[PDB]
């Protein structure tokens, strides 16, 4: 019975200092670790403070790191200085420990997505992907939003079968773009109404776009 | 640093088959290797520590062996719950390092993609940009190629793709490619075409439109 919580500001501009904190609620030999995972990539270890006070950092982070542990609050935290876009990743806290009987555990936290970019928060434009003239495909193009993430459903949730919402792509403009599609019986195009519900919580934008056949 | 090399990159199997995953370390780490499982949208989950011990509650069909440099993870009979990405990690010496990961995917019958082309919306054109989207739906294996042709000319450097995770129900992948042109460039050409190749197609599938439908 151990529970992890992590918090910290996730939207940063280049050269600012990332600061994350992790707390444990609920054992004597423990191993606090930070790991990060850029989108679509593998795991990269950041640093560890253990119960003996050993403190080590990934050498690739080039002395930009500070680790610290407030043992009163049980709060493990991370500082990463002079961030560039290369530091955009989900940051995980991991609390390794063993219990009263030498069983080992390593729960990981939920992760903080940190986006390092000079771009500024901006909600999306939503454009229809209109079905052509036994199966029909239609969609929504969620274009030019920052930062991640966006959520999309169809018909307020009544339509789930055949929905594909794609990983966003980051455009050279620094803004994200994303498409969400659903395949649907073509027999339904003249009677069934199709609406994509887009929510971009970072900007409190919420768009409901109707997608119709063209002509 | 200690470099961990996992193999294979992708393992394509069906439930009930045996799965063997390898993690080789660049120098001896004794038995101080751990294996983690990660599903899309979730944090990694510890499976095996110290080369051979299951974490509490991990099913017995998960087995780890190895000591020194060569390590092996064996899932003796796969369940639908086991398909995910597997990482090894070493805890011999700092810095702690991970393998690149092995993806364990469901092997299904090959399905050729269904291809659909969407021209840019009237509304997006008012903005001054044209996004042409091409959809490759529900195919297997994951490798598919999209080729854009504007006025029958091969395009390069003006498209972006992304591919979904393996579908939970039919075990296929889908792909979305966006060709972006300025409004002006878009109206300087007539024929827009999306050309698809895949192991399930014996010849390319083309979907096209001529601007002005």
């Amino acid at each position: 019975q151990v529970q992890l919580q992590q918090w910290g500001a996730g939207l940063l501009k280049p050269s600012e200092t990332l600061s994350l904190t992790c707390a444990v609620y609920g054992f004597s030999d423990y191993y606090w670790n930070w790991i990060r995972q850029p989108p679509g990539k593998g795991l990269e270890w950041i640093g560890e403070i253990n119960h003996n006070g050993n403190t080590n950092s990934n050498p690739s982070l080039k002395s930009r790191v500070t680790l610290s542990l407030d043992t009163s609050k049980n709060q493990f935290s991370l500082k990463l200085r002079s961030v560039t876009a290369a530091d955009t990743a989900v940051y995980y806290c991991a609390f390794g420990y063993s219990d009263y009987e030498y069983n080992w555990f390593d729960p990981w936290g939920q992760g903080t997505l940190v986006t390092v970019s000079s771009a500024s928060t901006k909600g999306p434009s939503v454009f229809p992907l209109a079905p052509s003239s036994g199966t029909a495909a239609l969609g929504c193009l969620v274009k030019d939003y920052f930062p991640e993430p966006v959520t999309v459903s169809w018909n307020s949730g009544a339509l789930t079968s055949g929905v594909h919402t794609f990983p966003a792509v980051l455009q050279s403009s620094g803004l994200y773009s994303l498409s969400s599609v659903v395949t649907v019986p073509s027999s339904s195009l003249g009677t069934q109404t199709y609406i994509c519900n887009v929510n971009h919580k970072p900007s409190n934008t919420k768009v409901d776009k109707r997608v119709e056949p063209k002509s | 640093e200690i470099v961990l090399t996992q193999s294979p990159a992708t393992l394509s199997l069906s439930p009930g088959e045996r799965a063997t995953l390898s993690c080789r370390a660049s120098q001896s780490i004794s038995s101080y290797l751990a294996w983690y499982q990660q599903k899309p949208g979730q944090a990694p989950r510890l499976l095996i520590y110290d080369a051979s011990n299951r974490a509490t509650g991990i099913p017995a069909r998960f087995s780890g062996s190895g000591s020194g440099t060569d390590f092996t993870l064996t899932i003796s009979s796969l369940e639908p719950e086991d398909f995910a990405v597997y990482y090894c990690q070493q805890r011999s010496n700092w810095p702690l390092t991970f393998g690149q990961g092995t993806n364990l995917e469901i092997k299904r019958t090959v399905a050729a993609p269904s291809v659909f082309i969407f021209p840019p919306s009237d509304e997006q054109l008012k903005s001054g940009t044209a996004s042409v989207v091409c959809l490759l739906n529900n195919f297997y294996p994951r490798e598919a190629k999209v080729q854009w042709k504007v006025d029958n000319a091969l395009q390069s450097g003006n498209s972006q793709e992304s591919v979904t995770e393996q579908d939970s129900k039919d075990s296929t992948y889908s792909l979305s490619s966006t060709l972006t042109l300025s409004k002006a460039d878009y109206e300087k050409h007539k024929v827009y075409a999306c050309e698809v190749t895949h192991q399930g197609l014996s010849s390319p599938v083309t979907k096209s439109f001529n601007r002005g439908e």
Binding site: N103 | I29, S30, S31, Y32, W94
Partner: peptide, 12 residues
């Protein structure tokens, strides 16, 4: 040590 980072409950 030869394996300084190993958690104490690991190994012999």
């Amino acid at each position: 040590g030869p394996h300084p980072a190993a958690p104490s409950s690991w190994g012999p």
